[PDB]
Amino acid sequence: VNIIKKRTKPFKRHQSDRFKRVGESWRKPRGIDSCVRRRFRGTISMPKIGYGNNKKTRYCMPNGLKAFLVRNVSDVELLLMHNKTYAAEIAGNVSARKRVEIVEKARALGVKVTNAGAKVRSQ
Amino acid sequence: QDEVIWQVVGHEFCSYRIKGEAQNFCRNEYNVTGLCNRQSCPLANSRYATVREDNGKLYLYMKTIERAHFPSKLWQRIKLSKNYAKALEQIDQQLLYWPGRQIHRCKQRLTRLTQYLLKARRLALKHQPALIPIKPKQAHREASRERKALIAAKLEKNIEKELVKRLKSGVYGDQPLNVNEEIWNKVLAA
Amino acid sequence: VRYSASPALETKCAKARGAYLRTHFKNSREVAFTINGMSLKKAFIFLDNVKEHKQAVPFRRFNGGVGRTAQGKEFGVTQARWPVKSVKFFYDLLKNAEANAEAKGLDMDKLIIKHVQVNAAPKQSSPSHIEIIVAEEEEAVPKANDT
Amino acid sequence: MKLLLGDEIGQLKFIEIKKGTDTSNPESEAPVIQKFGELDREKGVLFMLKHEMNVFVARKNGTIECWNVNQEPPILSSLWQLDSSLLETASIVSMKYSNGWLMLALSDGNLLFRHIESSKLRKLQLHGPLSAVELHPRIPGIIAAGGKENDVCLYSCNPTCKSNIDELELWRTENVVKVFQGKNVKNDSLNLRVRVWITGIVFTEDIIDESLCFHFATITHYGQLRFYDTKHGRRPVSTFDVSTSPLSHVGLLPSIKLLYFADKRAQISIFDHSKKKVIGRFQGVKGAPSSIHCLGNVVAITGLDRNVRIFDADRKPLANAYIKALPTSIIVINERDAEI
Amino acid sequence: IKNKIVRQQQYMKALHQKNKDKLERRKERAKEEEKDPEKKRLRLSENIPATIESKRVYDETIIEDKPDEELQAELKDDEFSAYFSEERKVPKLLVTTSKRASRKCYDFASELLDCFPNAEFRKRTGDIEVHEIAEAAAKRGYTDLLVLNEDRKKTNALTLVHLPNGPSFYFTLSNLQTAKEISNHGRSTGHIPELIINNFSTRLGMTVARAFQSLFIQTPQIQGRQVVTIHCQRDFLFFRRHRYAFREKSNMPDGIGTGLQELGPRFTMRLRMVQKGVWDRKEGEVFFESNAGEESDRRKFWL
Amino acid sequence: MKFSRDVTSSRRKQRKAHFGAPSSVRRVLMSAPLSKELREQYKIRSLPVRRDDQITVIRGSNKGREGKITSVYRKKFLLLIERVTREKANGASAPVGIDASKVVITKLHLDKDRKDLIVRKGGKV
RNA sequence: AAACUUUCAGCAACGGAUCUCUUGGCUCUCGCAUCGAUGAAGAACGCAGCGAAAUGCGAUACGUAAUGUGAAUUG
RNA sequence: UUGAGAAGCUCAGACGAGUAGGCAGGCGUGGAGGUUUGUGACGAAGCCUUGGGCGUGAGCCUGGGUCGAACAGCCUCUAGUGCAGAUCUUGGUGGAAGUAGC
RNA sequence: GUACGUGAAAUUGCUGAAAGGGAAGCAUUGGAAAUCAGUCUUACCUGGGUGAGAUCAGUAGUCUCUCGAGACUAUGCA
């Protein structure tokens, strides 16, 4: 099944572009005076359950394999029977040596490691 | 003694569970599918059968109720033959009259363990680059000592210091072609 | 010291700087953005005319109540003035701008002012930081004929 | 310490280095040399076997000879010459002496056995390509073969001997028979053939037919030092991954009753044969060692960093010099220092 | 002092005395030197500023300019002889690349080929290895063989081998700049460029530097007045290709000092590994390996 | 674990009584391990450090440099050994502080006090 | 068009948040009973080799005696 | 036919603004017990980013740079646990302006 | 570099690229410039011949478990 997104532009809290105190993460407005709350046309949209994505092609990367944080060499082993539905995303704090051994074994399991190239310059 | 050990470990806390976001995974070494399902967890399911390699040759591990209280002797073992059609015919003759769900798993984890050895052997025989680690302490030292050693050579100045010395010594014919007509006479004056 | 300019190579360039200079910040800037991009020895003949009221420096950005002069039209700017304290400080710097190539052994008669910077300072007034870049004009060799 | 040297351009460097001499240190004394020999590339040195005091330095053009170092400076005692046909296709990979005999084995199985003083030579033919051969030092007249895809096999002139044999009987082509041929280890952990490339053979029987159960250990280009036996069978009795760079030199340290090895990357490290593990490494070397000779409580490592160290049984660096050229083999003459 | 306010007032007053008597040391020195410029001399002959090049570690393999025979007996008969002897072999370069290289690795692989005539470009396709390339490239009249080895769309390393058995060198490119990025660049021409190589005091310095003489044509055209530099300085091999024009400059004592205009590229190498023999990263014998822990001393140099 | 209500396990109390101990406590906190040749002839695991001992340095960047202790600096918790001297820019030499726990004692400066400590504390002369 | 303003990015400034610590606080618990006309608590002044919002001390003054440890102090 | 986390799986219809209010499921922060044969000087936390990824969203995962000693996921316990606003408290910095003015 | 661990935001100056006819700000759909990612690198699968052996031997032994189940050491590699 080809992956699809009902929306691609994230939601952006109202007037979080003008003021630097107001952050961009979404916060539903609380006043009935609001133009946005009454949903006047022309104002920005809102997070609703309508924009929920397909319950089967959810959590999937655009390739089709879902992600999976592998933080050591025995976390990629579980992905042995799931190499065509999961991509072994290595965690960020893993050292640049313990990383180069996950790659050499995930490659045997045919698992896509998404960022195997970090800290690893090849010769 | 089975739903007891699934309503404890399957729903409250099990040390092997991994909270994924679309699934949950089991870190047990005797799981046949990798997931923490009811019909998959090796702790609740008290008659089980898994396939897992050990140093080149794939094995089959089986347990029963009547050995459950003996954790050392709990799992027996059968070594699976190299011929892939022989191994399927050897799983069945050992796993007879077991449910069709369980024997389905073992044959699927035989297809999945053979593809791992048939790949990691070809992968080991190819010649592939060396993943060598970068090191922040020794790439911030280079960048530090580079610009301290780049400006400490007067790179452009030492080029021209000998470039005229290469001219003034006369490695080119007396009147060369890379020089204009006037300043060569200064070299004649030199 | 780590400077703000990509130029000022070891090859044909030299730098000086001046920190915590007890002058105004909105007054040395308009001087600084006038002397910028000019040759070195001309800037000396330029600024001494400011010291004798022979030339005024335009006030482009911080043009608060600056009366019009007759000589501000040499650059097209309406308003200009003759600050004397700020240009006294720049002369001190540009001496070090010379005397650093005089120790590096450059060519002095192809020397332009490449990058002059004026910043603020930790308030005690409105003090200033200044760093200057003087560089040779990066000449061009004629191309060899054909191939 | 008295120790003789010879580089790839033929000349002989004769060193009087002593303890505490670090040529990198300005506050150390300078090396004392008496250099001679041919300065051309064609007479370049390959090996320096040590006859009891006479060095027998061979050359790439086949000018194997006899150098006595008792005289100061050494003067050539005698000289041999080999035919150019054995230089055309073959190349010299070994030279070892035991009981008045001198091999000059080549890279195709040609075994030129030359006598020392009687000068009666015997040539032999063997199996595929060679990379190392060796003589049993205790029992006279036992050879070990070895090369790439030519696993170790024990051709022996006299299989019995029982103490010793008269010299002129030795190494007749009629009596040399293989009394041992190696059998490979099993397949790898992925069912792949363990490819065999023997690079050096040393006889370990000191530190572990009358006098059977021959014991020896060999190294491989693929990086796996393997011990051997005959009473136990034709498989190696032990296999270790002592390193991963191709192992270049193996030998004994007879004062520790222990066996060392080396490689291309200079992981020259002693190896416990009793506890089956590497115990210590010779530190400070940065570059491929070309040859290593050991004598008593000292060793000498000459490397492609153009240096000659003096380590000991306890791998403590004694002396460290520079030699102005690319060396090829080192021989130790005097264990004592310069003042003795 | 555990206080912070006291600690930077006690130091402000301590510095303002150390910043005072230094002037009091130099003010009294200021009056006697213009009476007697001879004491000015001694000091100047005494207190020359000390710099890293003058405070090196004493390495005994610094070859002096005095010609000793054992040097020239070696390197007149090595494998670099054909590019140094009377034969004067024009070296034909082969520049391959790392497998599955990208676009940003290929626009740099045209800038080096601007530097090198008698140099082809052959992009590495599919499954082939460097040791099999060298033997397959020597049979078609090639001399050396460069390999640009990018990673993640930046070029980081460069290895050149010497055929068919010569020493193989593994540098790493750093501080990479193209020809477009440099301010006041120039066009290159078809003229074969000229060479300069500086500060290779070590013996290993005169092993790499000959393998850098080995890539350039042994007698260049002078009409282009193009110069290529390999300047070792603190074990970094600076590469700068310039085009010069001689013009009068009064400061330097001869009066005639040229003016350079860079062409590109602008890269800078370290030296990591050197292997006699074709470069196999695992099946090779190491002539020199870079110790990343014995280069901590900024006064220790190996090039 | 510790089973006394008259010893303290808090980092606060232990790390204060260390850094603010007087210069008699600051002596037995600066002790050095004896060499393996002295550990069997005095039967003492460790001695407090005196001046003019005969030590070797095991850890640190000054590995293996032997000497004698010049000035046992009880304040900043470090020994000061002979001729192991980091340079200074001006031209003078500076002393390098080697921790008193890193050195290995090879020859004691035996006195009447030390002997009367040696002969009772598990050993003899 | 340049300038000026605005916007983006890089760099330099400003500024001291975040993170990490912690000879400090706060809280609970346990043992103990001990100031003064034989001059207390407090105050002033002095005393250091070089001391300056601090410490110790009393003209025997950054303390003596007695015991114990055992060779330092430090800029 | 294996789709038994029966707290799962599966089939079919209708429905979808929402104030006071009512109900439910989750996200995040500091500490506590258990757990990950957990991550870390080959660089933990933080920070910045014209990089990529997920979730409807609160949020999370990650590449690059910076940096230098600690830190996180899961199940529970616990609260000094979430800010745009209070002529809000403290600190820092702007436009007014080099104007008012001495 | 004592204006000293990390060094956020406001805010200031320079440089680069843009935009600006008495309003910007944001949302939606796309153009132009810049730039980024995608495994596509290669892998896959199918006969004969040659060699290697092991779970093969009309084969001999050891140990731990439970007749045989694994781990082995030989020897052949039918």
From Swiss-Prot, chain A:
- Name a GO molecular-function annotation: structural constituent of ribosome
Q: Name one GO cellular component term.
A: preribosome
Location(s) in or outside the cell: Cytoplasm; Nucleus
Which biological process terms from the Gene Ontology are attached to this UniProt entry?
cytoplasmic translation
UniProt cross-references to CDD domains, sorted A to Z: Ribosomal_L32_L32e (cd00513)
Q: Which InterPro entries match?
A: Ribosomal_eL32, Ribosomal_eL32_CS, Ribosomal_eL32_sf
Q: Mind listing the UniProt keywords for this protein, alphabetically?
A: Cytoplasm, Nucleus, Phosphoprotein, Ribonucleoprotein, Ribosomal protein
**Phosphoserine (modified residue): where?**
74
Question: What's this protein's family per the entry?
Answer: Belongs to the eukaryotic ribosomal protein eL32 family.
Another remark in the UniProt entry says: There are 2 genes for eL32 in S.pombe.
Cited function: Component of the ribosome, a large ribonucleoprotein complex responsible for the synthesis of proteins in the cell. The small ribosomal subunit (SSU) binds messenger RNAs (mRNAs) and translates the encoded message by selecting cognate aminoacyl-transfer RNA (tRNA) molecules. The large subunit (LSU) contains the ribosomal catalytic site termed the peptidyl transferase center (PTC), which catalyzes the formation of peptide bonds, thereby polymerizing the amino acids delivered by tRNAs into a polypeptide chain.
On subunit structure and binding partners, the annotation says: Component of the large ribosomal subunit (LSU). Mature yeast ribosomes consist of a small (40S) and a large (60S) subunit. The 40S small subunit contains 1 molecule of ribosomal RNA (18S rRNA) and at least 33 different proteins. The large 60S subunit contains 3 rRNA molecules (25S, 5.8S and 5S rRNA) and at least 46 different proteins.
Q: What is this protein called?
A: Large ribosomal subunit protein eL32A
Curated annotation (Swiss-Prot), chain C:
Q: Which organism is it from?
A: Schizosaccharomyces pombe (strain 972 / ATCC 24843) (Fission yeast)
Q: Which family does it belong to?
A: Belongs to the universal ribosomal protein uL22 family.
Among the entry's GO cellular component annotations, what is one? Answer: cytosolic large ribosomal subunit
Q: Name one Pfam family in it.
A: Ribosomal_L22
User: What are the record keywords, sorted?
Assistant: Cytoplasm, Ribonucleoprotein, Ribosomal protein
Q: What does the subunit comment say?
A: Component of the large ribosomal subunit (LSU). Mature yeast ribosomes consist of a small (40S) and a large (60S) subunit. The 40S small subunit contains 1 molecule of ribosomal RNA (18S rRNA) and at least 33 different proteins. The large 60S subunit contains 3 rRNA molecules (25S, 5.8S and 5S rRNA) and at least 46 different proteins. uL22 is associated with the polypeptide exit tunnel.
**Tell me, which GO biological process terms does this entry list?**
cytoplasmic translation
Protein name as catalogued: Large ribosomal subunit protein uL22A
Q: Which InterPro entries match?
A: Ribosomal_uL22, Ribosomal_uL22_CS, Ribosomal_uL22_euk/arc, Ribosomal_uL22_sf
Gene name linked to the record: rpl1701
UniProtKB/Swiss-Prot annotation, chain D:
What InterPro entries does this protein's entry cite? Answer: WD40/YVTN_repeat-like_dom_sf, WD40_repeat_dom_sf, WD40_rpt, WDR74/Nsa1
Q: Which residues form a coiled coil?
A: none
Keyword set, alphabetical order: Nucleus, Ribosome biogenesis, rRNA processing
Q: Which is one Gene Ontology cellular component term of this protein?
A: nucleolus
The places in or outside the cell where this protein is found are: Nucleus, Nucleolus
Q: Which biological process terms from the Gene Ontology are attached to this UniProt entry?
A: ribosomal large subunit biogenesis; rRNA processing
Q: Which purpose does this protein serve, as stated in its record?
A: Involved in the biogenesis of the 60S ribosomal subunit.
Q: Hey, which family's this protein in? A: Belongs to the NSA1 family.
**Subunit and partners:** Component of the pre-66S ribosomal particle.
The name of this protein is Ribosome biogenesis protein nsa1
The organism of origin for this protein: Schizosaccharomyces pombe (strain 972 / ATCC 24843) (Fission yeast)
From Swiss-Prot, chain E:
- Composition-biased stretches, type Basic and acidic residues, lie in 18-39
Highest taxon above the source species = Eukaryota
- Identify the PROSITE patterns for this entry: BRIX
Its Gene Ontology molecular function terms?
rRNA primary transcript binding
InterPro entries per record: Brix, IMP4/RPF1
Using the UniProt annotation, give all residue ranges assigned to the region (Disordered): 13-46
What the entry lists under SMART domains is as follows: Brix
Q: One biological-process term from Gene Ontology? A: maturation of 5.8S rRNA
Highest lineage ranks of the organism?
Eukaryota, Fungi, Dikarya, Ascomycota, Taphrinomycotina
Q: What is this protein called?
A: Brix domain-containing protein C4F8.04
Extract one GO cellular component term from the record: sno(s)RNA-containing ribonucleoprotein complex
Q: Which Pfam families match?
A: Brix
Q: Which residues form the Brix domain?
A: 91-280
